[model samples]
Target: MSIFGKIMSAIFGDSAAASPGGAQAPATTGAAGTAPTAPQPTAAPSIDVAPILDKAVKAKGEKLEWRTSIVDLMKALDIDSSLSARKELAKELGYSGDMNDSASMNIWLHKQVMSKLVANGGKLPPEIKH
Candidate 1:
């Protein structure tokens, strides 16, 4: 996995949450008097990163302007959100835009990441959606 991917995994706990589980639960076999029942579909749990991130950022001792800036977001989370790292993330995420434009790229980067998080069992606010 790329550094950005690892950073995401660190923040979100596990990368498996992003992948849909294909294997189903085994059916419950009944005794001689009863028939076998169909396996129940298990619902995946969602992880809400918003509240955790809020408290984590607050515990950082100093304010990080992360609401708008992706760099601050990474800094507050103790992750490397530097230009080089972000550039790498952009590439990892298949960003085909101008890498030289930090402002535009950063905005898109955050939006895309947040979008993916929400899609993959992440509970974020509607505002987090681009």
Candidate 2:
């Protein structure tokens, strides 16, 4: 699997365990308000990304800034956080910057990964998304 693919699988695999009891009904309210909200079904396959990553961090017993750092996020998932691995992921994700500029690449990578996670049904908070 691709590096990011592995990251997704790791988080999603843990997401099953992160959810509590697994049978709670989603809250339903105001079906006919003036500003109608989108009908988000409870059955939607949404994965809460933070708790799963937090659990992984707890297991590791170290501080990892997964919310803002791609390297840390990959480390939280027990994936390789090496430059080579990240370069491969950057290539996979269509990064068109100088490979030598790792700091810039890392920042872009973190944002891209978070956004991609949301696109793939993973839920993250606003601060984490950028």
Candidate 3:
């Protein structure tokens, strides 16, 4: 799995296992003489994982700073936070910059990863994504 993939899996679990006998469910609601309402999306993937990750990281110690450190974030989740792994992630996310410049790349990774998590499913602190 990819770096972001692993983080998402950690938060959301196996996607295939999550669904069974796929069925359809309407998202809109309407009443007699009332305009139909748009689909109401449940908070990303049916659960908010921001607080869960916060608590887990705190319990792990090491003063892990995940807001800006992608490595620390992966470590807190028991994933490999290695340079090569991050390089692969950079590639996966289309980082068109120099791979040798890990410092700048790391910063970008953390920000993009947080944004992706929210986009796919997991919830994260608002400021963290920025």
Candidate 4:
């Protein structure tokens, strides 16, 4: 997967790890108890991103400015934080800035990533969402 895709996987997978044996729970309450209920479209559960990032920060045992810095965010998630990786992320996110101008690129990438998370059923703080 691309760096951006990996980043999404790391953060989303973190939430799944937080909840154990949830997906494997059987729908049937008892064996042959009664007629099965009709299957309905399950609403997407909102995944809060803050605590996941907070947990990663705590595990790292160091301060990381993940709220606004894409590099730090990637580092907090234990993903690649190299310039090339960021460049790849920028490209994946359709960044229009010159790749050499990493400072501005990073800022845009952070906001874009946060917005994308919100789009993917991730609930973030008001300040984090664009």
Q: What tens-digit string does per-residue lDDT give for candidate 1 at 33-130?
A: 56667878545486666655665577676776555666666666676666677667677777757564776876877776666555666776566656
**Backbone clashes (count) for model 1:** 0
Question: Candidates 1 and 3: which is better by lDDT?
Answer: 3
- Superposed Cα deviation of residue 117, candidate 1 (Å): 2.4
Q: How accurate is candidate 2 locally (lDDT)?
A: 0.71
Collision count for each candidate, in order = 0, 0, 0, 0
Lowest lDDT 10-residue stretch of candidate 3: 14-23
- Candidate 3 stretches with Cα past 4 Å from truth are 14-46, 59-61, 96-100
Q: Pairs clashing in candidate 2?
A: none
Q: What is the C-alpha lDDT of each candidate?
A: 0.61, 0.71, 0.66, 0.69
Error of 1 at 18 (Å): 21
- Which parts of model 4 are misplaced by more than 4 Å? 15-44, 96-100
In terms of lDDT, the poorest run of 10 residues in model 2 is 15-24
Tell me the tens digit of each residue's lDDT in model 3 across 83-129: 67766777787864756486776677777777767677555666665
Candidate 2 vs 3: which has more TM-score: 2
Model 2 error, position 65 (Å): 0.9
Give the number of the best model, judged by TM-score.
Answer: 2
Q: After superposition, how far is residue 2 of candidate 3 from its true place, in Å?
A: 1.1
